[PDB]
Design a protein around this ligand. Structure first.
Ligand SMILES: CC(=O)N[C@@H]1[C@@H](O)[C@H](O[C@@H]2O[C@H](CO)[C@H](O)[C@H](O)[C@H]2O)[C@@H](CO)O[C@@H]1O
Ligand SMILES: CC(=O)N[C@@H]1[C@@H](O)[C@H](O[C@@H]2O[C@H](CO)[C@H](O)[C@H](O)[C@H]2O)[C@@H](CO)O[C@@H]1O
Lengths: 286, 144, 285
């Protein structure tokens, strides 16, 4: 139930920089790509109490993680709902990791070969090579991502801190300055994110709820302030568009004043209506 | 008369992890223990021509044979199809011991778990085999 | 998350059998609602594994131990040994646990329900290796049909007045069905409901739309977080609890004034730790 239909990335506890990567029926271990090549949908069968692991490949749309019995090899094959295409997701409590066991034969579990950069089946042991990190793909893509943020009304402009001493936040033309770059961090406890401006070490995007709708950078050593935390919600049919709502009051959304696109225009929060001035592109700095 | 690469007779059985630990029964499990110089560490190996396999009985309990149960453990039990072993000789007297029967439609073999090459107190299990390179599935048969 | 939690452990293959400890022997036994079936999970972060320690009051140092290399599971003195550590693997979607030996992770606990004890197995898809691990309070209270007494008088109980009057008051115990409550735990809400046994779907509710009024309502008001309650063990007791409402969690359940007489109304009150907000939850004798 809790994982059914969820789209995730899967990385190695042994090497957190290596992700399950799919192309043309081959599964390998590869650096983060933040795209469909490393995304998988978990499909629950209640009867088997097991999951299919389906590639989000855009060309071949029916490929699932498959154990090539009787070898120890893994591939992606057309989904035929076969027992060798089903997996038990066993969460190692306290370790925040999963052992992924074959439903066909639970004596065997996925094993990460970090030097051959691929997967195989193995009997169990206490190493991290059989432990995997399964994460919502949005969190996976955004966590520790250094980005620039643009209103969809003007993708040449960005949300910025004005400078190192002026903590105000406004819309401005993109000039590659560090005051225009933000590093996103996910907090597991709060189930929310902070945006660290990269011109400071501990400066986070914050709703100053003591001054109406004002948003500013403030220090993150002010720990019990929900106003410093945000929900990042993907807009449908887009790869880079998000609504951004405040953890204190989730009805309050990151808002471009008036939908005005001039330099210096205020960034604030405002009641959520989902119009274009509350939609943001979070992107790689070029 | 000799029919195969491994003559009939009495053997000690060792894991490649330790030259000083010897296969014997402890309760209903099989484990590798310090040399006792006794019969329970002696194993009678007999070739069966009809199936081209081997049956292996304990010298102290000559009507009990290495077999396996429904819980993944090697066991000592009366004769049955589960007592037939198909060795693969991979070195001078180092063997991988497969079950004659496919199990869960795979090859299954003796397997001893190691913690940094220490197998003390580990029970011998029957686990899947895929190749001849798994150290945990390599066993020495010493004529003695 | 699980470290230092005190839990019961029962079999997915037979949810009426629990891990039971006495004098070094572990068996599978019916629900006792006592320390003989309670275990503290002790996490070692470096091993990413747990010790499973009996809450036995006589010997306080016994942990679930695999007697390697045999098939036998017992409780032995804690010596922090590898055969005393266990991987707790939660089977997601199935809401159960596989319990694997740290000394040999290919081997997991297997419930022999016919022999009523534990042994070991390599991994498979049978329910005999799956286990339900549950906080002991939830385990004891869930589906428990009880009677509820203020500690100021263990001879009176909280009751619904009758099948037509859904008011809730104090009254003397007479074994009436209106004087008994079936406790049900909502996993989603992480809270409890009290079902009166004189109704089918009548639950104890905070009528905040009369201020402090508590009363029985139907649970045909599907989402209503005042039909829900938290139950908290008063320290170093056996049967004593505080009962707080889900809407306002400082709104504890309250005996009016401390009045131990018949017909004294039952209400919520702001939590003040006091004795007219303490309660004993018991098996009806
Ligand atoms: C010049 C002017 O005030 N025009 C207003 C718009 O500002 C206004 O758009 C909203 O402005 C607020 C500012 O706090 C928020 O950004 C809000 O999301 C915008 O919708 C509209 C209202 O529809 O009316 C004028 O055009
Ligand atoms: C008649 C009267 O009010 N006497 C008061 C008690 O009410 C009071 O006890 C409290 O009463 C309130 C009212 O609902 C709550 O029930 C509360 O839990 C009780 O503690 C005591 C306080 O010591 O003082 C008088 O006797």
């Amino acid at each position: 139930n809790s994982l059914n239909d969820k789209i995730v990335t899967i990385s190695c506890k042994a090497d957190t920089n290596l992700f399950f990567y799919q192309v043309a029926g081959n599964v390998s271990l590869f650096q983060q790509t933040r795209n469909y090549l490393e995304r998988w949908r978990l499909i629950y069968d209640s009867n088997k109490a097991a999951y299919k692991i389906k590639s989000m490949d855009i060309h071949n749309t029916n490929l699932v993680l498959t154990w090539n019995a009787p070898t120890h090899n893994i591939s992606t094959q057309q989904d035929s709902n076969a027992d060798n295409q089903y997996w038990l997701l066993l969460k190692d409590i306290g370790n925040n990791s999963f052992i992924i066991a074959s439903y066909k034969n639970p004596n065997l579990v996925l094993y990460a070969d970090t030097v051959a950069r691929n997967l195989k089946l193995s009997t169990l042991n206490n190493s991290n090579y059989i432990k995997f990190i399964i994460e919502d793909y949005i969190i996976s893509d955004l966590n520790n991502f250094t980005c620039k943020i643009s209103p969809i009304l003007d993708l040449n402009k960005v949300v910025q801190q004005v400078d190192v001493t002026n903590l105000n936040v406004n819309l401005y033309t993109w000039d590659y300055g560090r005051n225009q770059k933000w590093t996103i961090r996910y907090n597991e406890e709060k189930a929310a994110y902070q945006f660290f401006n990269t011109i400071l070490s501990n400066g986070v995007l914050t709703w100053i709820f003591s001054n109406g709708n004002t948003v500013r950078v403030s220090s993150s050593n002010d720990q019990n302030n929900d106003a410093q935390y945000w929900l990042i919600n993907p807009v449908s049919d887009t790869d880079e568009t998000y609504t951004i709502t405040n953890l204190r009051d989730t009805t309050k959304a990151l808002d471009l004043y008036g939908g005005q696109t001039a330099n210096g225009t205020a960034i604030q929060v405002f009641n959520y209506h989902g119009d274009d001035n509350q939609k943001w592109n979070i992107r790689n700095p070029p | 008369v000799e029919r195969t690469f491994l003559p009939n007779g009495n053997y000690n059985i060792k894991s490649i992890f330790s030259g000083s630990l010897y296969l014997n029964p402890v309760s209903k499990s099989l484990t590798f223990s310090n040399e006792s110089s006794a019969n329970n560490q002696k194993w009678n190996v007999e070739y069966m021509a009809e199936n081209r396999c081997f049956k292996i009985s304990n010298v102290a309990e000559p009507n009990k044979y290495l077999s396996y149960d429904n819980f993944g453990f090697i066991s000592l039990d009366s004769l049955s199809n589960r007592c037939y072993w198909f060795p693969i000789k991979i070195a001078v007297n180092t063997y991988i011991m497969l079950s004659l029967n496919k199990v869960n439609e795979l090859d299954y073999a003796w397997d001893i778990y190691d913690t940094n090459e220490n197998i003390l107190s580990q029970p011998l299990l029957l686990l899947p085999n895929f190749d001849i390179y798994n150290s945990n599935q390599m066993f020495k048969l010493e004529k003695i």
